[PDB]
Amino acid sequence: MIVLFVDFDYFYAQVEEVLNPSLKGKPVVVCVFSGRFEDSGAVATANYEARKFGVKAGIPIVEAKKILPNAVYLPMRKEVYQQVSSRIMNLLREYSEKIEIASIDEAYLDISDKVRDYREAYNLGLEIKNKILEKEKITVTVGISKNKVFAKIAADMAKPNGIKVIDDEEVKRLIRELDIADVPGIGNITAEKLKKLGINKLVDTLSIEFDKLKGMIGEAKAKYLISLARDEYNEPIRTRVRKSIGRIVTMKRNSRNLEEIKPYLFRAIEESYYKLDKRIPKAIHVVAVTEDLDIVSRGRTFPHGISKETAYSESVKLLQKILEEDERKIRRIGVRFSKFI
């Protein structure tokens, strides 16, 4: 079984670069301005000219300018990146019907057919990296291996602009050498709970009584880990589908004032509805980020679709329930529509 994982390099920055080659060579930072103040916002992503100096997704736009005051800073243009991504996803389809679009820049292909071994796999890897670099002019990294997890790990290793294969001989040394935290799906919270269990490697998951592990990180997660370690993880490449559509915005000022909030909320709803395009939700949730960056939410499922008129009205009772229930001031507000017909 051979899985090939494709991963567009510093994607947003690269796209901004492809749309204005004059940028190539310079440090480019794609930002998300929250407009609360001068350069308030976070970094969506940066190309390597910037990443090599610490500028990476998540850090404040202000902190980055301290590091590279002369780098190019650009506002995020989601739609544009999204279309470029789709086009690229097709070039990839033409390499296997078995494709799993994970994110806006990640995908897996089941090429157990086409290829007969890790060699022809590699070639197909160079062939693909090439077609994309030609058709759209964008570099991607290719991870190749037995299952999705290791194909992705190969990618993390071989990037940027690389391609790497992780054969069975190596998978086994990794299940031993590779640090557990460096395993897809293990954030810091998990990584932390894992230390406390003396589990710092995939292998240690076999020296613990499953039931204790299930009580620490959860059944799903514990089974996930245990099967990888046992060299038995074998998840299929399935095609995913949008299960929720939403929009969250930041308010110039933290508020509790219903009226002060509504405008931001209706705007979120409006945008959301435009995005739903043809899709009809039976579920709605109102989401809020408290002034201490905590998240609060209240929803409701209807026994039928939801009209914009109903959503408008219904989202207000939920924002009210929120303010009634919680007392902190609200920083960001938004809606999320799920359970399409």
Add this chain to the structure above:
DNA sequence: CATGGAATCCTTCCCCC
């Protein structure tokens, strides 16, 4: 200082054979 989007799992009810 810290945008914003979305999927998945875990707990806690809760109604009911």
Add this chain to the structure above:
DNA sequence: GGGGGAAGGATTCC
């Protein structure tokens, strides 16, 4: 006791 869902939160990663 446990099936079946809805809710609200926890956690991960793009």
